[PDB]
């Protein structure tokens, strides 16, 4: 009922701010994002890696196969993996040497669940390095790979119009 | 005071959190190793860096016939 | 909050970028950064050039 929730700016204290509002926090947005890392960690990553790798994968095709350097290609290759498959490699390790910001190094192991987590204090890290690996390892097999059922597909395609 | 949609209605109520979705698509370990080389790593990643980048660059240029600049 | 590229300490700390930018552009000013002794310095310009 309350003019917008029991009317609060933030979670409650005003003072951090973020002026929590729609597009910050509406039952409708907020939800379109929790198997995914925004709030909770669904599973120990390893898997999120490829839905991340892959979805972002078959992107970067018409960007560099329809806007390519000398464009609209007559080659077997593009439509194409090509260079883009090269980008997921540069990308994916530009990605790794960031997982040298956190190492923090363990196996604990839980994608299995005890007791509704809370994480407890997930906010902030508590991702060890042996986590950020299995993500940016999922990234490679998500990038390269997610680059082929892009071109594998014939483009049945829609014409400008 | 009849009307009021007497506690109307609530939800339980206007909580949400406690089970909004079953979590994830099955795929369990349809990958698990499956491809190891980032699933193995300690230690790697040079190894790979010279490899990927050696092909990309190596065949990336040389030959067959020109097609020149 | 780590301890990091050395000769300086003053530099070696601020998180703020000044730590890199500056990192490069002391390298050459031998006299009177951390290391230096009149015997260091001299030689530290000799096997330099």
């Amino acid at each position: 009922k309350p003019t917008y929730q029991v009317i609060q700016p933030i979670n409650g204290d005003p003072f951090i701010g973020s002026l929590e509002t729609p597009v910050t926090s509406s039952p409708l947005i907020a939800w379109y994002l929790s198997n995914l890392p925004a709030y909770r960690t669904a599973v120990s990553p390893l898997l999120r890696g490829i839905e991340v790798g892959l979805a972002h994968g078959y992107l970067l095709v018409g960007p560099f196969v329809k806007a390519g350097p000398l464009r609209n290609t007559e080659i077997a290759g593009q439509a194409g993996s090509l260079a883009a498959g090269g980008l997921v490699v540069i990308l994916s390790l530009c990605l790794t040497i960031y997982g040298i910001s956190s190492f923090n190094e363990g196996a604990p192991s839980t994608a299995p669940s005890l007791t509704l987590t809370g994480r407890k204090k997930e906010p902030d890290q508590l991702q060890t390095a042996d986590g950020w690996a299995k993500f940016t390892g999922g990234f490679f097999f998500g990038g390269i790979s997610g680059v082929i059922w892009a071109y594998f597909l014939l483009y049945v395609l829609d014409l400008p119009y | 005071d009849l009307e009021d949609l007497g506690n109307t209605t609530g939800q339980w109520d206007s909580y949400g959190s406690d089970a909004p979705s079953p979590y994830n698509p099955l795929q369990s370990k349809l990958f698990e190793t499956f491809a190891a080389p980032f699933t193995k790593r300690g230690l790697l990643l040079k190894f790979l860096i010279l490899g990927g980048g050696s092909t990309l660059a190596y065949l990336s240029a040389t030959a067959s016939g020109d097609i020149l600049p | 909050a780590l301890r990091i590229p050395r000769f300086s300490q003053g530099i070696a700390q601020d998180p703020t970028t000044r730590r890199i930018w500056f990192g490069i552009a002391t390298a050459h000013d031998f006299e009177s950064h951390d290391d230096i002794t009149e015997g260091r310095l001299y030689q530290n310009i000799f096997a330099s050039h």
């Binding site: 040298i100 910001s101 | 660059a57 190596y58 240029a61 040389t62 030959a63 016939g65 | -």
Partner: peptide, 30 residues
């Protein structure tokens, strides 16, 4: 084989940079 001396611009102008921009992110950490 015919006409093929194109490697000393990526190994250098491309890949050598990869090394150091990676590597030398030792300035951040190692």
């Amino acid at each position: 084989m015919i006409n093929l001396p194109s490697l000393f611009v990526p190994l250098v102008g491309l890949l050598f940079p990869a090394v150091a921009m990676a590597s030398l992110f030792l300035h951040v950490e190692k």
